[PDB]
Design a protein around this ligand. Structure first.
Ligand SMILES: Cc1noc(C)c1Cn1cc(C#N)c2cc(Oc3ccc(NC(=O)[C@@H]4CCCN4)cc3)ccc21
Ligand SMILES: Cc1noc(C)c1Cn1cc(C#N)c2cc(Oc3ccc(NC(=O)[C@@H]4CCCN4)cc3)ccc21
Ligand SMILES: O=P(O)(O)OC[C@H]1O[C@](O)(CO)[C@@H](O)[C@@H]1O
Ligand SMILES: O=P(O)(O)OC[C@H]1O[C@](O)(CO)[C@@H](O)[C@@H]1O
Lengths: 441, 441
């Protein structure tokens, strides 16, 4: 009675499955349609992309369905704002068809592809369009959560057009002045029929968040579940202030020299040289304020000590726990635990070390780190190879499959600069020799 | 260069501190005053107490300063609503003095006692009172965060009076009808001068949350930091729906029989008997829906398997990691690691096992569990001794010092019923023998 077996890869205790003569599968909670609401140049695509990047990283399969991309596919070349005119009978039919084709793909993603969240990235400015999306959600048993971005500041609108609209594939053959003028006219096409969300009377029963004046104020109505609560918390932690994220590993340690994994060894002579090189690098960056974060492991703390700056130790930044394989070389792992070695090589993200962790466990541990990185400005994170790959996968939108193989060499700073599309990444090698700890698939 | 030492209790790497001939101390971010806003019977004291319980548990020293308690101290016996009349010159002076005496204690708590958050629990219904609190915060370099509870539903108001107001020390000599009538008149004394928070025009620069219609809607304005963001997320996860939380340990395991700590051993014959007894108990509770949560350790999963109910495994529910002391008996710990054994006995909450955890680390890991327990209704958590003590300390408002010594015997269910003041706790022993794993200080 109560016979369990431990799964080889993830190390999960499951009931011993003595399937009957004819094994039956039972193939396969409710998916969510996130509805973006607002006039053009209100950061809807920015919100869509950032939220999708975060949700995928935490393990919630999410996809953006941008109606404009369906339009660029249906209509070969973009000419002008005249396409967006409310009196343009033909283009209005085309635009509706594009929205319906995107919703068709939303249904296929959530009901047939194992997707959990579909972000419907369009203006959805009219009650009519939103009633149609709600009907689509109710008939398919999907939850609907609305995210509206409201802003009347002309400086914010003009800045968004200059930063990411003029560079749109629609304005390829246009100069900055033509594109800006056309886009202002394009926004005006939407202003007459725009009906903002009204949680007070009309939209009282809808689950929604109103992001007002680029996150200065929020109106939150009827948060139904955990994922909606998490989105609201995320939106309240992110910001659009300029800043830099520097990510690096501790300087080379004694275990690195011996080819040993885990442990709590100190910096080697080269590691100490990197720590000095890092201080000079940090100084040369001339940052008004800089937060320094380390793990609770000696090698990252010794590296931070060389900076002569205040730092904070996070247990969440500690390297992946190798369980029984801690302090062993990869050769000793292959010889003592050959089954374990091969299992990891085959499934590096989900593989859990015996009495240890997986990259999947790392993500769960690092989520508060990500949330705090979002709220901060200039931050230097001194961590470890697996931790760094996980954080980098979040910033660079890398999949779970790619994550355990990201190149994070020793004595190299990864400088992350948030641009309008995601992160610009610059690599800075601090000219101090070390061993190589990267292992390809 | 870069010489560090590992602190004996917490195992934190610190710079070797070779203090000079004359050692200097440097004794000791900005504290926060949380301002409750709203008419009486709006759940301000309920919010104050629950939020304080959560903030203290996560390690943020928090205290409630209820102006009514300062009034009950200054004014010996309460007679009627006549004390709260706006034309009561004398009582208005007394009430102001009480609020100023509470603020004096707020200053002493935040600036002199190492308190981080002071919850100022009063009506604070007038702009004048709030301007005075803001002046007090600005002059003392304290942050101000407002939490307003707005509700016009007479059913909600009447229910609150019947549940927790009539039982107030003010209404000791009154019967339910007299107390209800007096309290309605008391609320009416505040209605004329009540100026709700206006984040649109007047309170635009204030950091605030408006909880509308018992959490149906929220107005969030200017969230400045991490703690305010966390409070907002907490308020959006909690609910006032009736439910039951059942907490228990896995049935007795093989390591329990050998007096061994940690490990991933299976249920003993008695443990299997408890698992059956637990199924019968659960069935007899006749709960419409019940969520079952386990750790990823075998003994909790085997216990859940006996229920024949769907369950979810949480790595966050895994027992405290004993590091190098894993799978050892307490006698073997005392003989192999006597220094470690004595250090733990002296500082059980902060003590970290070598390459292992502390109760302090458990709290950090269990925070997402608490957040999900809040969002859920009927939940059964099958876990481990140290995990159970931590969760119980949250629900029962126990300090960090008390937490490692809470009695959590094997084969015993802790039934938690949320009442208006906190949790009512019922213990249910399922009449199956086991070893005792409790060790007093
Ligand atoms: C790109 C880009 N960089 O600067 C600007 C301006 C843009 C383009 N943009 C224009 C927007 C508009 N309207 C907008 C809204 C956004 O949605 C937001 C959602 C949440 C928050 N949240 C916060 O700012 C939190 C809340 C309080 C503390 N910090 C801010 C914006 C995000 C980006 C937005
Ligand atoms: C005791 C007690 N039990 O039922 C009632 C009614 C009471 C007394 N009471 C009266 C209130 C009023 N007005 C009130 C507000 C509260 O503040 C709240 C703060 C946040 C939330 N949040 C939620 O409900 C979240 C948001 C959406 C999902 N669930 C609710 C109430 C908490 C308790 C309150
Ligand atoms: O996932 P991988 O490739 O083993 O890399 C993570 C490893 O890198 C190290 O930080 C050093 O090689 C080890 O501590 C850790 O086991
Ligand atoms: O903090 P204490 O008193 O050692 O209790 C926690 C211990 O209880 C156990 O669950 C069983 O005694 C061990 O796994 C764990 O080390």
């Amino acid at each position: 009675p109560l016979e369990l077996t431990q799964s080889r890869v993830q190390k999960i205790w499951v009931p011993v499955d003595h399937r009957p003569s004819l094994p039956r599968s039972c193939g396969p909670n409710s998916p969510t349609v996130i509805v973006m609401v607002g006039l053009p140049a209100r950061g809807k695509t920015y919100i869509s992309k950032k939220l999708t990047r975060y949700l995928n990283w935490i393990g919630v399969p999410t996809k953006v369905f941008n109606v404009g991309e369906y339009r660029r596919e249906a209509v070969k070349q973009y000419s002008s704002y005249n396409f967006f005119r409310p009196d343009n009978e033909e283009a209005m039919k085309v635009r509706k068809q594009c929205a319906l084709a995107a919703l068709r793909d939303v249904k296929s993603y959530l009901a047939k592809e194992g997707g959990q969240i579909a972000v419907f990235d369009a203006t959805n400015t009219t009650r009519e369009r939103r009633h149609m999306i709600l009907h689509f959600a109710k008939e398919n048993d999907f939850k609907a959560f609305f995210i509206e971005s409201v802003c009347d500041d002309p400086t914010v609108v003009a800045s968004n057009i200059m930063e990411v609209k003029i560079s749109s594939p629609d304005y390829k053959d246009c100069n900055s002045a033509e594109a800006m003028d056309d886009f202002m006219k394009r926004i005006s096409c939407y202003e007459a029929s725009y009906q903002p969300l009204d949680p007070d009377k009309c939209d009282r029963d809808l689950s929604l968040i109103k992001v007002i004046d680029v996150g200065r104020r929020f109106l939150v109505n009827r948060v139904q579940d955990h994922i909606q609560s998490r989105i609201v918390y995320y939106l309240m932690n992110i910001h659009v202030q300029p800043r830099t994220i520097y990510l690096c590993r501790h300087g080379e340690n004694e275990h690195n020299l011996q080819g040993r994994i885990g442990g709590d060894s100190g910096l080697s002579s080269r590691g100490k040289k990197f720590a000095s090189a890092l201080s000079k690098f940090v100084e040369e960056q001339n940052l008004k304020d800089l937060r320094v974060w380390t793990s609770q492991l000696k090698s990252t703390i010794q590296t931070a000590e060389a900076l002569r700056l205040p730092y904070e130790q996070w247990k969440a930044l500690n390297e992946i726990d190798a369980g029984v394989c801690e302090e062993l070389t990869y050769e000793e792992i292959r010889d003592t635990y050959p089954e374990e070695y091969a299992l990891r090589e085959q499934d590096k993200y989900y593989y859990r070390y015996p009495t240890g962790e997986s990259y999947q466990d790392l993500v769960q541990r690092l989520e508060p780190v990500i949330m705090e990185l979002e709220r901060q400005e200039n931050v230097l994170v001194i961590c470890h190879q697996a931790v760094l790959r996980c954080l980098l996968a979040y910033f660079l939108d890398k999949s779970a499959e790619e994550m355990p193989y990201l190149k994070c060499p020793l004595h190299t700073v990864l400088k992350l600069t948030p641009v309008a599309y995601g992160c610009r990444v610059e690599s800075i090698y601090l000219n101090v020799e070390s061993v190589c700890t990267h292992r390809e698939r």
